[PDB]
Amino acid sequence: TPEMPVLENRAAQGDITAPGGARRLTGDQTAALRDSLSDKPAKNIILLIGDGMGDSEITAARNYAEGAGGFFKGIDALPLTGQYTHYALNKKTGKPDYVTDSAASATAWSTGVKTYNGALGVDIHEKDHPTILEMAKAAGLATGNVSTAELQGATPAALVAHVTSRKCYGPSATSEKCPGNALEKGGKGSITEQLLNARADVTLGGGAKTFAETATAGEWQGKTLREQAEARGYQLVSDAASLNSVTEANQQKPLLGLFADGNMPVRWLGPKATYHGNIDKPAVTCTPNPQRNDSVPTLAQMTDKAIELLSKNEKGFFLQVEGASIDKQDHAANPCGQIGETVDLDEAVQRALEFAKKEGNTLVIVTADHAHASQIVAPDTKAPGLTQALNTKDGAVMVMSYGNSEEDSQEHTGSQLRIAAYGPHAANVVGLTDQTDLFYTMKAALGLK
Amino acid sequence: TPEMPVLENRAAQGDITAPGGARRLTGDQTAALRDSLSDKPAKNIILLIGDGMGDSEITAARNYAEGAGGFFKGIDALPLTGQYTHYALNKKTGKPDYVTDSAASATAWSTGVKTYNGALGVDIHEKDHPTILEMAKAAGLATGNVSTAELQGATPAALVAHVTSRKCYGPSATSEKCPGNALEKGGKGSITEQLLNARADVTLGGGAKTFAETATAGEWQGKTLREQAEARGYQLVSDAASLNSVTEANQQKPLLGLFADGNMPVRWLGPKATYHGNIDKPAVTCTPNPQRNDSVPTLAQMTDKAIELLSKNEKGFFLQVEGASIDKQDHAANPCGQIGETVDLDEAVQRALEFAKKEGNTLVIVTADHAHASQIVAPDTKAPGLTQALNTKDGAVMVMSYGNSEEDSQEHTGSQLRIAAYGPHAANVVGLTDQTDLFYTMKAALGLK
Numbered sequence: 001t002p003e004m005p006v007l008e009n010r011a012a013q014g015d016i017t018a019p020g021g022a023r024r025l026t027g028d029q030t031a032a033l034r035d036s037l038s039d040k041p042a043k044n045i046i047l048l049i050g051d052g053m054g055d056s057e058i059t060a061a062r063n064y065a066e067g068a069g070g071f072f073k074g075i076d077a078l079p080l081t082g083q084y085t086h087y088a089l090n091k092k093t094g095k096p097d098y099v100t101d102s103a104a105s106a107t108a109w110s111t112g113v114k115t116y117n118g119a120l121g122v123d124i125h126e127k128d129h130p131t132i133l134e135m136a137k138a139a140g141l142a143t144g145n146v147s148t149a150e151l152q153g154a155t156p157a158a159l160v161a162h163v164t165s166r167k168c169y170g171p172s173a174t175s176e177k178c179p180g181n182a183l184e185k186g187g188k189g190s191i192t193e194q195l196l197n198a199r200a201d202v203t204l205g206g207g208a209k210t211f212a213e214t215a216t217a218g219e220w221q222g223k224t225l226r227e228q229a230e231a232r233g234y235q236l237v238s239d240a241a242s243l244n245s246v247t248e249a250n251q252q253k254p255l256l257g258l259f260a261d262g263n264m265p266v267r268w269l270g271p272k273a274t275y276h277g278n279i280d281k282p283a284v285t286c287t288p289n290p291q292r293n294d295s296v297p298t299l300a301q302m303t304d305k306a307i308e309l310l311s312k313n314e315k316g317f318f319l320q321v322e323g324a325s326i327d328k329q330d331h332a333a334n335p336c337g338q339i340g341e342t343v344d345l346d347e348a349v350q351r352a353l354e355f356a357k358k359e360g361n362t363l364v365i366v367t368a369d370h371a372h373a374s375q376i377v378a379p380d381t382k383a384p385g386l387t388q389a390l391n392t393k394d395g396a397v398m399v400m401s402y403g404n405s406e407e408d409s410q411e412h413t414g415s416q417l418r419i420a421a422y423g424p425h426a427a428n429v430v431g432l433t434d435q436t437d438l439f440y441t442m443k444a445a446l447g448l449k
Numbered sequence: 450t451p452e453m454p455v456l457e458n459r460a461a462q463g464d465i466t467a468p469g470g471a472r473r474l475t476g477d478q479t480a481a482l483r484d485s486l487s488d489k490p491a492k493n494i495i496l497l498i499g500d501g502m503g504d505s506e507i508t509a510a511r512n513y514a515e516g517a518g519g520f521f522k523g524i525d526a527l528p529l530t531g532q533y534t535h536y537a538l539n540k541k542t543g544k545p546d547y548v549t550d551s552a553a554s555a556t557a558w559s560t561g562v563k564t565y566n567g568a569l570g571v572d573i574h575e576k577d578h579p580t581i582l583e584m585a586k587a588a589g590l591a592t593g594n595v596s597t598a599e600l601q602g603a604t605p606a607a608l609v610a611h612v613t614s615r616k617c618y619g620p621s622a623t624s625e626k627c628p629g630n631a632l633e634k635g636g637k638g639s640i641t642e643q644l645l646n647a648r649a650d651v652t653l654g655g656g657a658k659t660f661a662e663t664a665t666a667g668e669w670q671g672k673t674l675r676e677q678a679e680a681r682g683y684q685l686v687s688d689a690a691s692l693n694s695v696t697e698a699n700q701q702k703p704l705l706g707l708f709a710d711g712n713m714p715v716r717w718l719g720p721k722a723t724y725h726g727n728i729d730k731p732a733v734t735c736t737p738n739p740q741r742n743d744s745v746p747t748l749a750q751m752t753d754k755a756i757e758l759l760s761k762n763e764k765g766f767f768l769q770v771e772g773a774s775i776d777k778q779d780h781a782a783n784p785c786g787q788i789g790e791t792v793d794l795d796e797a798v799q800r801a802l803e804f805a806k807k808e809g810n811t812l813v814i815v816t817a818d819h820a821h822a823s824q825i826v827a828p829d830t831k832a833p834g835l836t837q838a839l840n841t842k843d844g845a846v847m848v849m850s851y852g853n854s855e856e857d858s859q860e861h862t863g864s865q866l867r868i869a870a871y872g873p874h875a876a877n878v879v880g881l882t883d884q885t886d887l888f889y890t891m892k893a894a895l896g897l898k
C-alpha cells in the first residue's frame with residue numbers, strides 16, 4: 001500500500017541565480033499528498049515542541065545552518081503543514097490574552113482547555129483537567145516526557161502537574177505561591193511531587209536541583225524528593241552512560257534521568273546581540289559549547305532511548321520531546337544559542353521521523369508553543385533594540401533583531417505559527433487550527449476514551 | 450457530486466473558557482483534505498497578494514476584527530496551507546539577501562527567477578524574463594492586474610515591466626535612473642510605458658499621476674501617457690460608476706482604471722504607534738476613513754468587476770489582485786491603517802473564493818511577498834520602538850509593536866510565511882516551498898508551454 005512519504009529533498013534544486021534554480025519542488029505534489037492522508041488509528045504519537053520556535057526562528061536557523069536554499073531534514077520534512085493560534089485567557093475577565101506564556105499554551109495542547117498565563121493543568125476556575133499523558137497511561141499506553149529544560153519547567157510540567165502557578169517547583173515554593181496545592185494544606189503537591197505521583201515510564205531532562213527538596217507531609221515527609229523517587233521505585237540516571245545501560249523502563253521500574261541541576265547545556269555559544277551590533281561589531285560565527293560533554297546526552301540521544309524503551313509496550317505510546325532553550329536564548333537575545341537549539345531539535349525530529357517512517361503507525365507532530373522576538377532584518381538596519389550580524393553557511397551575513405523590550409528578556413509574541421505533521425491523522429493540522437485542537441486530534445488519533 | 454470544499458467555519462466552536470470551547474475543528478479532516486486534491490488542469494488563476502501580510506499581520510487583524518477565536522471568511526478559508534521562502538539575491542555576489550523588497554519578490558513569482566532588491570522583471574545580469582501575465586497573454590488567456598497601490602508600485606508593475614530599478618515610473622525617472630531602459634536611449638521604456646505596451650485586458654489601481662508625463666521618443670512623443678492610452682484603444686475609467694458601466698474588456702478595448710493620483714484611500718483611520726504608546730496613551734478604536742468613498746471602488750468591487758469581464762474569455766484568465774497598503778501602513782507604524790487593509794483584502798478573497806467555488810476550475814492562491822515589522826506583544830510591554838494599544842472585537846486590549854527601525858520607515862523582515870490555496874494544483878503550496886516555485890505551479894496549472 002502507499003504507506004506515507006516524508007518530503008525527501010526540498011532544498012533549492014540548482015543555481016539560485018538562474019531560472020528555476022531556487023525551486024524546492026521537482027514536480028507535481030498532488031499524488032504524494034494523496035498518499036500522505038490516512039485516518040487509520042495512530043499507534044504512537046511523538047510530539048516535538050520547539051519552545052518559542054515560530055516561523056522566524058525556523059527561517060533564521062535554516063539561513064544560518066543550512067543556507068537560505070537549504071532544507072532541514074527533520075523540521076522541514078513533514079508533509080502536512082498548517083498554522084495554529086495559541087492565545088491565552090485573562091483569568092479575571094475570561095477574555096483572550098493575546099500573548100501566552102509557556103504554561104498556558106502547554107496546558108492547552110495537554111488538556112484541550114484554555115487557561116491563564118501561569119496556570120499548569122487547571123482552567124481559569126482553577127479546576128484541574130486530565131492531561132494527554134494521564135489519559136494515555138489510564139489506557140495502558142507507555143508514556144514519555146523529554147526536555148532539555150529543568151523538568152519543573154512549564155512545558156514538561158504541564159503533562160504531569162495541576163498547579164495554579166508555574167512557580168510551584170517543589171515544596172517550599174508551593175507552600176508559598178500555590179497554598180491550595182501544598183501537600184501540607186491537603187493539596188496534590190508541588191510540580192515535582194505531582195511529577196513523581198504521575199509516574200511516566202520515561203522522564204528525561206534537567207532540574208535535579210528541586211529534587212534535593214524535602215517533603216513537608218505525606219508518607220514521604222522529611223525524605224528528599226530524590227530519596228522519595230528511589231523509594232517509590234524509579235530508576236534514577238544522571239549521565240549518558242547510565243542512560244544507555246537502561247534496558248527496561250515501565251510502570252514498576254520507571255526511568256527518571258536528571259542530567260543537570262537546572263537546564264541542560266546549550267549547544268552553541270555566541271555573544272549577546274547589542275545596540276547597533278550589526279553596524280558596530282563584526283559578524284559572528286557560532287562556537288560549539290566546549291562544556292556540553294560526551295557525559296551529557298543530546299536531545300536526539302534522549303529521544304532515541306525514549307523511543308526504544310517506550311516502543312517495547314505493545315499497546316502504543318505517547319512521547320513529548322521539548323527543544324527548550326530556543327525560547328531561553330531568544331529571551332536572552334543570543335542568536336547563536338537560539339539557532340544551535342533549533343539545529344539540535346532538528347536532529348531529534350530526524351530520529352522521530354526515522355522510527356515513524358519505518359513503523360507506519362506513528363503520528364509525529366512538530367510545532368512550537370508560541371512565537372517570540374527575533375526578526376531577520378536587512379544587513380544595514382539602524383534599529384532601537386538589540387541586533388547582531390552573523391556569517392551564514394552561504395557566506396553572506398544575516399542580521400537578527402530583538403526589539404520588543406527595553407527590559408531584561410525579549411518577549412514572546414502572539415503571531416500564529418507553523419504546526420506540521422506526518423502519519424495517521426496528520427490532516428488535522430492543515431489549514432487554521434487552535435492549539436486546543438492539538439489535544440483532541442491526539443486523543444482521537446490514539447483513540448483514548 | 451464532487452465539489453472541492455472551502456473551509457466554511459473555523460471559528461472557535463464554543464465557549465473559550467470551557468473544555469473544547471476553543472476548538473476550531475468539529476471532526477476529522479482527512480476526507481475533506483482528500484476532496485481538496487485535484488491534479489486536473491486549472492482554467493483560471495486568481496492570485497491575491499497581501500503586500501507585507503506575514504503571519505503576524507494576519508493574527509493581528511483577526512484578533513482585532515474577528516476576535517482571537519474568530520475566522521476570516523476569505524483569508525482563513527483556504528484548505529491547503531504551507532510556508533514559503535522569499536529571500537532575494539545580492540547583485541554583485543549572487544549570494545542570498547535574506548530580506549527582500551517588494552520588487553525582487555514580485556519578480557520571483559512572476560518570472561520564476563530570483564533577483565536583487567529593486568529589480569522588476571530582470572535577473573542579476575539585467576536580463577529580461579517573460580512574466581506569467583505575458584505568457585498567459587501569449588497563450589490566448591485573458592489577463593488582469595488589480596491593485597490599491599499606484600500601478601507603478603513594485604507588485605503590479607512586476608507583471609508587465611522589465612526595468613533595472615523599481616523607481617523608473619515614467620519617462621522622467623527612467624531617463625535618470627534606468628538610462629538603458631529609457632525610450633529616448635533605445636530602451637523598452639519606463640514602468641508606465643511598458644504597462645501600456647503589455648496591454649493586459651483589465652488593469653485597475655491608482656497611480657494616475659505619472660500618466661500626466663509626456664513620452665520623450667517614439668510614436669507618441671510629446672503626448673501624455675494618458676493621451677497615448679486613449680490613442681491606443683484603452684477604455685479609461687476613474688471612478689466606481691464608470692468602472693461599473695464597462696460591459697467588456699478585451700484586447701480591442703482594454704480597460705485601464707485609474708482611481709487615484711497615488712495610492713487609493715486607506716479604509717480605517719487611526720493614530721501612528723508611538724514610543725511607549727501602550728502605557729502613555731489610551732487604547733485606540735479604529736474608525737472608517739471618510740475619504741474612502743462611494744465613488745472609489747473597493748478592492749472587492751474591482752476584483753468582482755475584473756472577474757466578470759475576464760470570465761467571458763472562453764480560454765481562461767490569470768488575475769493578480771493586490772491589497773497594497775497592508776505594507777505601507779506597516780511601514781508607517783499605523784496599526785489601524787494596516788488592519789483595515791488586511792480586512793479589505795479578506796473581502797476580495799471572499800469574492801474570489803465564491804467565484805472559484807461555483808466555477809470548479811480556478812486555482813485561488815492567497816499569500817504575501819515577504820514578512821514585516823509588527824508584532825503582537827503583552828499589554829504591559831516597555832519596548833524601544835513604537836507601540837499602540839487597541840480595543841479589539843473581544844472587548845480586550847491588544848498591543849502592537851514596530852521595533853526594527855530607528856529611522857523613518859519600519860522594515861520588512863525575512864521570516865518565511867503562509868501561502869494558502871484552493872482548487873486544482875493547490876497541493877503544490879503545501880509544505881515548504883520557495884516563492885519561485887509559485888511561478889512554476891501557475892505555469893503548470895494553466896498548461897503553459
Ligand SMILES: [Mg+2]
Nearest residue numbers: 051153154155
Ligand atoms: Mg519550557
Ligand SMILES: [Mg+2]
Nearest residue numbers: 500551604773
Ligand atoms: Mg506592493
Ligand SMILES: [Zn+2]
Nearest residue numbers: 051052102369
Ligand atoms: Zn514557551
Ligand SMILES: [Zn+2]
Nearest residue numbers: 102327331412
Ligand atoms: Zn519564554
Ligand SMILES: [Zn+2]
Nearest residue numbers: 500501551818
Ligand atoms: Zn512588499
Ligand SMILES: [Zn+2]
Nearest residue numbers: 551776780861
Ligand atoms: Zn514595503
